[PDB]
């Protein structure tokens, strides 16, 4: 039945932490570490079949 969705004004948003650069630039360089990095998993730790 005659209906459609189109698009008109698209935007991205980013709410950063308003931090003091003294602690911001130190720990982004400490996350810049070879050992201290980031890892993210899932609750669905599962594969799929068809």
């Amino acid at each position: 039945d005659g209906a459609s969705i189109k698009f008109d004004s698209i935007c991205l948003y980013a709410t950063f932490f308003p931090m003091a650069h003294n602690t911001a630039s130190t720990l982004e360089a400490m996350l810049r570490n070879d050992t201290n990095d980031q890892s993210f998993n899932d609750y669905l730790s599962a594969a799929n079949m068809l």
């Binding site: 003294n22 400490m30 570490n33 070879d34």
Partner: protein, 171 residues
């Protein structure tokens, strides 16, 4: 007893520990004895190779004690690089309290220069434990030969040699 193959360790990566050793066949040469003038060569070229893989086994790694240990500390297996590089800040820690809340809004620092830096270590928080991480497998268990198959039935045999094997119990 007389002609065995050099045993080759089978691997499982994410565990870190090798499963067990096995003989080579898909490149093993013809054993249909060519004659009395080449039998000493096919048994002789292999014989010096048996000492090639024997000598390096004591050099590349310390001689076998626990043949396959999962609970493994780091000594020959290398813990990753411990060197940090620390840089300063464009803005100071204590030279900012004077301005913004009072009236003057803010947007080496070319206002009031100061030099203050603090360096902290990059190393793995506590030492490496468990299996081999990246690539230290060849340096840990080099292909080594048991030239007298199962010589000694009830006491001990090639134990951790089996892939269907864990360190806790045999079988």
């Amino acid at each position: 007893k007389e002609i065995p193959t050099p045993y080759m360790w089978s691997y499982q990566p994410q565990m870190g520990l090798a499963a067990g050793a096995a003989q080579d066949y898909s490149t093993r040469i013809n054993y249909m004895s060519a004659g009395p003038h080449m039998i000493s060569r096919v048994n002789g070229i292999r014989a010096h190779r048996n000492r090639i893989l024997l000598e390096q086994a004591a050099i590349t790694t310390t001689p076998r004690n626990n043949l396959n240990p999962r609970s493994w500390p780091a000594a020959l297996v290398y813990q990753e690089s411990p060197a940090p590089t620390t840089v300063v800040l464009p803005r100071d820690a204590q030279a900012e309290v004077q301005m913004t809340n009072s009236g003057a809004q803010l947007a080496r620092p070319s206002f009031t220069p100061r030099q203050a830096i603090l360096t902290l270590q990059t190393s793995s928080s506590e030492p490496r434990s468990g299996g081999i991480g990246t690539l230290q497998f060849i340096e840990e268990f080099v292909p080594s030969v048991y030239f007298n198959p199962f010589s000694g039935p009830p006491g001990h045999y090639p134990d951790q040699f089996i892939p269907n094997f864990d360190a806790v119990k045999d079988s």
